[PDB]
């Protein structure tokens, strides 16, 4: 039980927690420690055919019991280890001999009363490593230890055959086709159900209608209950004119042949619940640093995923459905995309069957039946959402206790994070305790109900985020945990969570799946990349048009008022006569809703502002929720009500509204609000989030100007590059890009001079990719965006149909005169909210993945000879309207400029490599251009998170990727402050290594006042094999994804982007771009860059400690940067940055200071005086070296009558009065009468024994502390005056 030098301090890569700063009476830390023994034969246990995962992991665990052990080495504020508590090899432990009502009997010296026998389940609990330990400050001297199974500890070393990556590679000795795993065949019209297409209404309802419209007339959509069990009388939604192309058989999503070797968990939710030894556990116990009974135990409690399963909203059981569930279901079928909102196909981590249900059948409702009315009634649901092994293990970590109850807020997933699959914590866990920690109940919640009550007024960051929800909890949050800490007087949760997917919110025209590879893959599930790609040509007029309303104009020459490819160049006016002529007369009742011929349109921004779950000032206000994203693309930091969370009840009951609509008759009249049955407690949990933030408290294009300012660790050069005429342009911010165009000439040309710009001259920068008539006239563009479907002449405005006639016959056109001058991938429009593209999902996701530093690129030419995108004569930045700017306009990630991005990277030029890599994008006009995306070389994944270091009650932070954020102004935001401060990382070898997160070994706050993080360059866990031994074109990595090809039509040399750049059928373009896909692998990327091996030079290994930059309270101030209403905030802060670009320190940008010390760094230990590193640095209270306990020599004793004592202390403050301080402790130095004190701990009237612990005003921290060198035994000492 004594200290064992063999075992060493460490820190697990799920929570990274081995040092709890203990305070109160016995400051120190429950030092978490493991043997530093390497050379562990993982391959010993073989997963044969007969054995299952359960017994295989049992064999692994028992073999490790025979090969490894763990203990918790409690530390003292001095830094002297006392005892370890080895769970495996501790003999005959005991729990506290509590009282009748539950109090623990603890004589300070005789110690906590033992029961002789410890909590049961020794066999299956001694084999669980301690990964975490927490303190309960409400109750006295209570402690927990988080027992996690060790298969997590050795998780990454198990045979890959069982733990299978989601992506399949095999030999694939045929180049590597990123599209050969994507279902690419488009839907087609059926040849047997022609007459069931949605039918145009019989006769328009005049209703005293004075307005007349020459355009096509609306569709009549109604569903009536009638009288039938499994059918109805008329189901207009269930019309399904389209069908899967019969190309080499049906094209459909079905796992049993779309996944030869499918992703699959290890242990199901029920399996882990029933199994005890393989599941986590939290144990209440008690520590006695100065008693012969050093340790005593309380209660042992398991964490049951059955509480997760029972506490999900009923709708979660049927994720393949959704609140819409009928038209959207059919659309997803036909477009070959996500079925539901959280199907396994796009998110298998949480499905206990894994990808085995990566299909469409069995959505909880009747589907596929011939008669359209028949489909829609509920039936068996075989695809529920549960907590499989990986997700459950990600659901453990950073637990904290409040009052009489404890919470486990989830791990971070690295322990079970494989190379591309991203599991994480989905639902919070709660534990309570009854009758003074005598019994407990295990319960857990879904974070969806925790986060349902979100509204923009809460956060000071970016607005309209995809965070809200509706009465159906088809929103699937999941937190990446930085460590919930009791920051000051508020409780803070920080890290990242997965936004509701804002990428696949648009849809694809039925005949446009073979030329939108980018987004079709981004949606189907073969592209786990969560940035958000820009392909505007093929979007629908509304993403939510029922399929039966798609073929009313199949040719598209008439331009399909009900359904047509989105192009707001033609968007109908919102003019009065226009609206009351097109939409009003088609009034919709409860039973019937009118799909209006009106030509809705708009670029991706308007598309999202309509059909994305943007946060509105009222919570529970997200009706259009498409899907939940891939991996955390949202930095997060919120404050969670301690008192409320304590109050909330364990079990959750759901009302009628929680489940889905019984039948489509009811569905047709869905509401966002309904009366919950008062006997249900689910909605109690709603308003728990006080606020939240993801980035600095900035809005609009100014936020992306900040994005421009932030630098890239891969080179350190910021994106702008302006300091030191065909020069690189800013990529994120469009300020000072292109030419200034007038919003006054945009669209209606009316009421715009002082609407979106508070200046006499509304001058804004159209951005890169813009077009204009000519240098003479730039503001606005005449309607030359005319789209001719066939060769039947252009869109034909002013046509009899295209012009409306209100009462009076004054025929007028419904399409606006002058359109905006940018539909670029970086299109920026404050006014044309139907032509802008810089949405807040863009802004936040780019913040996250640019702080990570792994934003993708789009390329034409690799570094190959004769295929080199050289700089001179083919990169003319000043001219970006023509092909000289090399702007693709199709396949690039929305919100940035490809040429500028690649200059920032250094793929061409000296920015990255000594020799120009000769990799870049050309806007070739000779013929069609093939291209794709690739990784950034870096591999800082998104689930990355540090441990939340609480700097003070007003700020905090952690490390994210290679950067160190600090929420400087989140708890107490201040006007004019940027909001956050940043610190970068120095070690290049650490930066570029394969898996740079087998390097961070926990974070803490250094006593000096600035946190740090550990780095172990020798611990870099790269890929298991160098593509075995043969070079595999596809080689996995944290941030490797199937970036599909994008092949585009030829570009017109001049006036390139009048219209959208049409794509060509790129399905079979993979084999012709082998060189381009060679760069899709990070290893090849770094090989080209010249930093593929240790050739980067510099630090040999760089094993040291990195410290974030010191932040003045004014750090991050942009007070002068803002305002200046002479022009817009974006441009004024751009000028501010250009005046302070070379002062990254002031803004909050820097590189963490690094100190090199030799050693096999593995963890840290914490004492309130100072946190020590790796368990070294023994201290002996240097300041108070010359003070010790006075032996019995300086006591009366001798032989006299029973000594009367205890009169010198009172039921008041129990410290001995100042009269008799030095009677027991030697003070040859500290003779001062203003310090040096004592603290009694117990006594006995009839025996006269006195027990005290010294207490003195600590200089460094003005807090009263105990002392160890007082006596060899310890500050606690009995003073018994024997007997006569």
From Swiss-Prot:
Give the protein family.
Answer: Belongs to the adhesin P1 family.
Q: Which organism is it from?
A: Mycoplasma genitalium (strain ATCC 33530 / DSM 19775 / NCTC 10195 / G37) (Mycoplasmoides genitalium)
Q: Which UniProt keywords apply?
A: Cell membrane, Cytadherence, Membrane, Signal, Transmembrane, Transmembrane helix
GO biological process, alphabetically ordered: adhesion of symbiont to microvasculature
Name it: Adhesin P1
Which stretches are tagged as biased composition: Low complexity? 200-214
Q: Where in the cell is it found?
A: Cell membrane
Q: Where is the composition biased (Polar residues)?
A: 787-796, 804-814
Residue span of region Disordered: 173-225, 781-821, 863-885
Q: Where is the composition biased (Basic and acidic residues)?
A: 182-199, 869-882
Membrane-topology descriptor: Single-pass type I membrane protein
Q: Which gene encodes it?
A: mgpA
Question: Which top-rank group of organisms is this from?
Answer: Bacteria
> Sorted alphabetically, which InterPro entries does this protein's record hold?
Adhesin_P1 (IPR022400), Adhesin_P1_C (IPR004940), P1_N (IPR022116)
The function of this protein is:
The protein is the major adhesin mediating the attachment of this mycoplasma to the ciliated epithelium.
User: Would you name any one GO CC term?
Assistant: plasma membrane
**Classification via Pfam families:** Adhesin_P1_C (PF03257), P1_N (PF12378)
